[PDB]
Ligand binder design. Structure first.
Ligand SMILES: Nc1nc2c(ncn2[C@@H]2O[C@H](COP(=O)(O)OP(=O)(O)NP(=O)(O)O)[C@@H](O)[C@H]2O)c(=O)[nH]1
Ligand SMILES: [Mg+2]
Lengths: 168, 467, 168
């Protein structure tokens, strides 16, 4: 099995852990507890070729987990997550991308923008706005919700496609 | 680099050398080390190795008592500040407010990461491997004494998380599917009539779907605490490993049930219809990736009472003999063709503990407990990293559940299977073989005709679902 | 280069996994990896002729009692291992021989009674009794010690010789 070292980055309280557990264990966690480092391992078939995702779950609390540069060294592809009901986390994506490029020392790192928390009726971020940000970076954009398991299976699968295109 | 505190006041500051820790030839993989070093690498500050937290906490009870580990975690969490330099002292000596150029770096690169990973180990320890605290009620008290000690607005959210987990674990997972479960498929036996259930009355698919849910549930309950010490073979098998032994004993029941159905059908035309029904079930096990069921039907057709039935296997259609030869090849050559199937599928799975039990047990016998290099006894962490790769390969299959509907009436029929009856293991195995010598006697004795047993028709509905 | 399939057969408390390991770990005990192919396959010279041993040791699966018939079918020769300490394991050899007989369906099966853990004291089974049992069956008897690797090579080589003799 070819191994993909996915890394999940994002602001605090956006659903990185709920989105990663939803992919791994197919069950949604509602209790919110900050995560320093979690590593999950999943085996899937993506486009017919069996791969093993090694989904490292990072911490979102600024100044409360300053080891961010340690995770980005080991990852292959990143999954910038923001909560659409949370405006503040959306602008933060730019800082994450900048922090990713400096660590990887490249401008073509495989990334996916993911907009979590779709089922919540409030929408402080518009889909058209996020795609415009996603268009400038060139990374794709996926619209996901952890409770209804929408797009969470496509969000991580898309990032594997991005790493596969980048690797050759 | 940076001036770590003096090794006299802080044990873990002692520098790496060949007498402490051995690295395997970008994250370094440690081959061995003294206990002090393993907790140093467990909560190392430069890199994040979240496998190590899972590899260490699974297998550490061989080389470190649970009480002793927590004393090392306290000693790791309480990091003393390095002694100030002369210029920093001059501000301190005169009362001047010191700039603290090096201490400012120290608290951001050494104390902040190391203190943060210690709580990561503490919350990982409590959440997953909680049986340590239940057995030792004194350990939980020292755990809660440590949590209260943690102070600061930073790391005040995390001690809320550990405390929330402890109170949750002391008093003791809804699944969402993208797809609806396929509808239950029925046959001669009608829903709600438990008395008419049997091998031929039930639909071949729904026998295979309920066995897969029944076997998946027994597979997902097996925790690594029942495998890591090679404990299931010790004399405390029923106390240490109740979950694992319930899955092994279920696999044995089905294999004997499949043997019992085949040899107890006296009439050849009926028996051929049964053996074909079982192969249709073995075909659904391959669709559902239920490799435990595949090796509990293959193990029934390779058993001595059923292998010798050469007359009843000649009448099977060659399509279904191709399935059995394909399914039996999985177990050939030390499971080489099955191991390659287990690593190339989209898992919802029920793997086979046959090969994880014989790898965990031979990894623990073969490798030595400690490594002696330069005259000092280092804990062989390579032995306990190989073991935790197997108990970490079990778990990557336990996560994903099945999208199948649980039928309570059938699932109760398979939990309450007693192929042995009141008999014992050796008597039954003889009873099956002798009944196999009765229905197809060894050559050159004639094959006697036998009466038909089942009243209902024997036409198999087929592995294809009705949709 | 003929490849002989050997099967080690016994109870769960007679230490047969150690017997297979001591056959393979002839040089060093620093490392051992049961997964790789070199762990159960060993190329050895016996009576001046080179040959290959493919040993099916299934330690730990003793609770999978219904799968014993499938395992013993693969091999051509068998070791029946009983602990000298456990007198119970001595009366269990008869059933293992009977099962091997009815799996291979032949009255004469290449087999070698093996007495394991011979070096430790409290020898509840005497050598004379085991020699008498082996004479009754018509199969060789070997005393092996799992710790000191004394006689392990004798056991596997005598099994290979019995496999060769039964062929002719
Ligand atoms: N309604 C709704 N709630 C969600 C969704 N995704 C996450 N949540 C909730 O929002 C909170 C975020 O939880 P979590 O996944 O742990 O976020 P996090 O990114 O891990 N926080 P941190 O980065 O500090 O570890 C939880 O209460 C979770 O239940 C979603 O799609 N819908
Ligand atoms: Mg998290």
């Amino acid at each position: 099995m070819t191994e993909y070292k996915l890394v999940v980055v994002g602001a605090g309280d956006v659903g990185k852990s709920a989105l990663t557990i939803q992919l791994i264990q197919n069950h949604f966690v509602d209790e919110y507890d900050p995560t320093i480092e979690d590593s999950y391992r999943k085996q899937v078939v993506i486009d017919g070729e069996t791969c093993l995702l090694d989904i490292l779950d990072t911490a979102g609390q600024e100044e409360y987990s300053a080891m961010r540069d340690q995770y980005m060294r080991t990852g292959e592809g990143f999954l910038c997550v923001f909560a659409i009901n949370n405006t503040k986390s959306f602008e933060d994506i730019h800082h994450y991308r900048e922090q990713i490029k400096r660590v990887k020392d490249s401008e073509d790192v495989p990334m996916v923008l993911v907009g979590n928390k779709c089922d919540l009726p409030s929408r402080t971020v518009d889909t058209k706005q996020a795609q415009d940000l996603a268009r400038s970076y060139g990374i794709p954009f996926i619209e996901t919700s952890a409770k209804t398991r929408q797009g969470v299976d496509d969000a991580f699968y898309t990032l594997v496609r991005e790493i596969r295109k980048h690797k050759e | 680099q940076m001036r770590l505190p003096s090794a006299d006041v802080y044990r873990f500051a002692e520098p790496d050398s060949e007498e402490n820790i051995i690295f395997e030839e970008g994250i370094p993989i440690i081959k061995a080390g003294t206990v002090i070093k393993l907790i140093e690498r467990l909560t190392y500050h430069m890199y994040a190795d979240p496998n190590f937290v899972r590899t260490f906490l699974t297998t550490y009870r061989s080389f470190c008592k649970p009480q002793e580990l927590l004393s090392l975690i306290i000693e790791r969490f309480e990091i003393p500040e390095p002694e100030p330099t002369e210029a920093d002292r001059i501000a301190i000596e005169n009362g001047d407010q010191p700039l603290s150029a090096e201490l400012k770096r120290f608290r951001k690169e050494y104390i902040q990461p190391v203190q943060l990973r210690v709580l990561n180990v503490c919350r990982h320890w409590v959440e997953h491997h909680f049986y340590d605290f239940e057995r030792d009620a004194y350990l939980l008290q020292r755990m809660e004494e440590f949590i209260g000690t943690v102070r600061g607005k930073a790391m005040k959210k995390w001690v809320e998380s550990i405390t929330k987990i402890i109170q949750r674990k002391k008093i003791a997972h809804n699944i969402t599917f993208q797809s609806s479960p396929p509808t239950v498929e029925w046959h001669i036996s009608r829903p709600g009539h438990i008395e008419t259930f049997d091998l031929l009355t039930l639909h071949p698919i729904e026998i295979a779907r309920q066995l897969t849910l029944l076997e998946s549930d027994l597979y997902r309950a097996v925790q690594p605490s029942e495998l890591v010490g090679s404990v299931w073979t010790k004399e405390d098998k029923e106390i240490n490993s109740p979950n694992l032994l319930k899955m092994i004993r279920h696999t044995t029941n089905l294999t004997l049930w499949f043997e019992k159905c085949i040899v107890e059908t006296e009439n050849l035309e009926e028996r051929v219809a049964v053996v074909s029904r079982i192969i249709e079930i073995l075909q659904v096990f391959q669709e559902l990736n239920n490799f435990n069921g595949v090796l509990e039907v293959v193990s029934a057709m390779n058993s001595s009472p059923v292998y010798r039935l050469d007359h009843t296997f000649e009448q099977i259609p060659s399509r279904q003999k191709k399935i059995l030869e394909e399914a039996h090849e999985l177990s050939e050559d030390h499971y080489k063709k099955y191991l390659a199937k287990l690593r190339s599928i989209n898992p919802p799975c029920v793997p086979f503990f046959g090969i994880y039990l014989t790898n965990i047990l031979k990894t623990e016998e073969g490798n030595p407990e400690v490594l002696k290099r330069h005259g000092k006894e280092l804990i062989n962490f390579s032995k306990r990293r190989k073991v935790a790769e197997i108990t970490g390969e079990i778990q990557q299959y336990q996560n994903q559940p099945y999208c199948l509907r649980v039928e309570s009436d059938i699932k109760r029929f398979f939990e309450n299977l007693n192929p042995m009856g009141n008999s014992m293991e050796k008597e039954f195995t003889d009873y099956l073989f002798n009944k196999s010598l009765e229905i197809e006697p060894r050559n050159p004795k004639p094959l006697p005709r036998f009466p038909k047993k089942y009243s209902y028709p024997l036409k198999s509905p087929g592995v294809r679902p009705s949709n």
